[PDB]
Structure 1
Amino acid sequence: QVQLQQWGAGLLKPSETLSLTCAVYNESLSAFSWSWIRQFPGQGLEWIGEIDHTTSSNYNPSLKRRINISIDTSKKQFSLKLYSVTAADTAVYYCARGGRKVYHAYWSGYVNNCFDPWGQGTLVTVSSASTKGPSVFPLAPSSKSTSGGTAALGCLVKDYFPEPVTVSWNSGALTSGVHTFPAVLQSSGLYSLSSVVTVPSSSLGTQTYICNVNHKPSNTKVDKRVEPKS
């Protein structure tokens, strides 16, 4: 059970420098090589570069001249820097465990350079737009409590930057029949998404439904009650 935790800034202005750090928690740094991977919007994966416990690092040829990768073996962390950042560098950056140190017989090298486990990921957005907190509006259910079928209600998360925004219902008590749509970039430059959930119509008068909207960039947490309109 190896754990990988990462952090960094997800919003940068152009021409700035991206900085991210990954943290290995349940394993030896020495045993494995550590690599950085990014995933473009609705695209494939690109390998950035790897590093050993020895200072030695290998980079992708395309990014060789804009990359720095280091390892702080005291903290068991390895970092990634990307200089002169651009919107083309906007992607989800992942930590990963690369090849295994094998001393036999003897390569003295890292062998299976494929990545498991992966990091959770850090969505870096390259824009000069400033961060905005979201507004949460109720998507009230029309349906009468006594219709006796299924009813749908939800929350509308409007006008925020940047991504992402996580939405839960009743702190996660309710996860069944919950649909959270991927956000859409409006013409205003602000993101917007809605989270809906289908529940029995006979519980619109007993059960209380609250959506939990979190936006980490703005440090915004909102709990919204969704109740049938009178």
Structure 2
Amino acid sequence: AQLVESGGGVVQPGRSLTLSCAASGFTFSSHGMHWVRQAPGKGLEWVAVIASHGNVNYYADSVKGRFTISRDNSKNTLSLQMDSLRAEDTAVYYCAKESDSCGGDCSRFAFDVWGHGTMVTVSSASTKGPSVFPLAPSGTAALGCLVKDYFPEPVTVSWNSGALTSGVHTFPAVLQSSGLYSLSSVVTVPSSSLGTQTYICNVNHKPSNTKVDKRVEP
């Protein structure tokens, strides 16, 4: 059994997005359906439920009046209409099926089938590619690249077009007060290689179609 999840996106505050899940391999109309989310740095949060026959719904206080859950028991789909979006609604969203009864021992109070997760980002920032600055090396040396002031997530970083992987750490992005993200990618290498090996950080930001190859030199 699967719930095949789609939708989401990146929008301005006060705007709207839709999420959808399509049922596969079970009888959709026989089960209550839920949405659950996880915001950055936070735990799982229950969002909403709709009963099997779509006759009753219920919402977390945090989203009541702004999100609308619905289902289509003909197309066997589940929807979450998210209106009036707030920055704190930024999260990975999952759809979830109520667990099965089994003649007494099993309850419907767990979640047995989950959608893969789909990202919703709410921000006043608009799409912007990163600036990329070298972190030049001062037995072991460290060097890196600062990938600054981009939106939205994610960026990808490789070194020497993937040839360098040992010792690489690309840090999670931090959201700056500006609303833009920033991260660093570093690598530690033998001090001997500083003179013979070329180090190039390859930065790709698909939302802005930005690609930067920055050489980092002693």
- How does the TM-score come out when normalised to structure 1? 0.71
**1:138: which partner in 2?**
134
Fraction of identical pairs, as percent: 55
What displacement does 1:157 show? Answer: 0.7
Runs of 5+ consecutive residues of structure 1 not aligned to the other structure: 143-148
CA contact under 8 A between 1:36 and 1:93: conserved in structure 2? no
Structure-2 separation of matches of 1:32 and 1:200: 58
Q: Which whole-Å CA distance do the structure 1 matches of 2:43 and 2:149 have between them? A: 28
Q: 1:89-168 residue pairs with structure 2 within 5 A? A: 89=89, 91-102=90-101, 104-105=102-103, 111-114=108-111, 117=114, 119-127=116-124, 129-142=125-138, 149-168=139-158
Secondary structure at 1:88's aligned position in 2? helix
Alignment RMSD, CA only? 3.6
* Structure 1 residues 136-176: Cα deviation after superposition (integer angstroms, max 9, x where no partner): 2232334xxxxxx2221212111212333333334555444
Q: Tell whether 2:51 aligns with 1:43.
A: no
- For structure 2, the 5+ residue unaligned runs are none
Look up the SS of the partner of 1:65 in the other structure: coil
In structure 1, what is the Cα distance between the partners aligned to 2:3 and 2:140? 41
2:17 counterpart letter in structure 1: L
* Equivalent position amino acid for 2:130 in 1: P
TM (norm. structure 2) is 0.74
1:198-213, aligned counterparts within 5 Å?
198-205=188-195, 207-213=197-203
Cα distance, 1:189 vs. partner? Answer: 3.9
94 and 87 in structure 1: CA distance in 2 versus 1, 3 angstrom threshold: closer
Kindly provide the CA deviation profile for residues 92-121 of structure 1, in whole angstroms up to 9, marking residues without a partner as x.
Answer: 12224332333x4379x9724236646244
The structure-2 alpha-carbon separation of the partners of 1:8 and 1:137, relative to structure 1 and needing over 3 Å to count, comes to: same
Change (3 A) 1:158 1:53: same
Query: Secondary structure, in 3 states, of the residue corresponding to 1:50?
Result: strand
For 1:228 and 1:52, how far apart are their aligned partners in 2?
61
* CA displacement 1:33-83 (0-9 Å, x = unmatched): 543222334233321123577545633241343222244678765332122
**Deviation of 1:219 (Å):** 3.1
SS at match of 2:127: coil
- SS of the counterpart of 2:129? coil
Structure 1 residues 110 and 196: CA distance shift in structure 2, 3 A: same
Aligned to 1:82: 82
SS at match of 2:217: coil
Distance 1:138 1:36, change over 3 A: same
Return the alpha-carbon distance in structure 2 between the equivalents of residues 200 and 3 of structure 1.
48
Q: Does the CA contact (< 8 Å) of 1:151 and 1:199 recur in 2?
A: yes
Displacement of 1:196: 0.8
2:200 and 2:32 mapped to 1: Cα distance?
44
Preserved contact between residue 2 and residue 113 of structure 2 (Cα < 8 Å): no
> How many matched pairs?
216
Q: Given that residues 9 and 121 in structure 2 are in contact (C-alpha distance below 8 angstroms), is that contact kept between their aligned partners in structure 1? A: yes
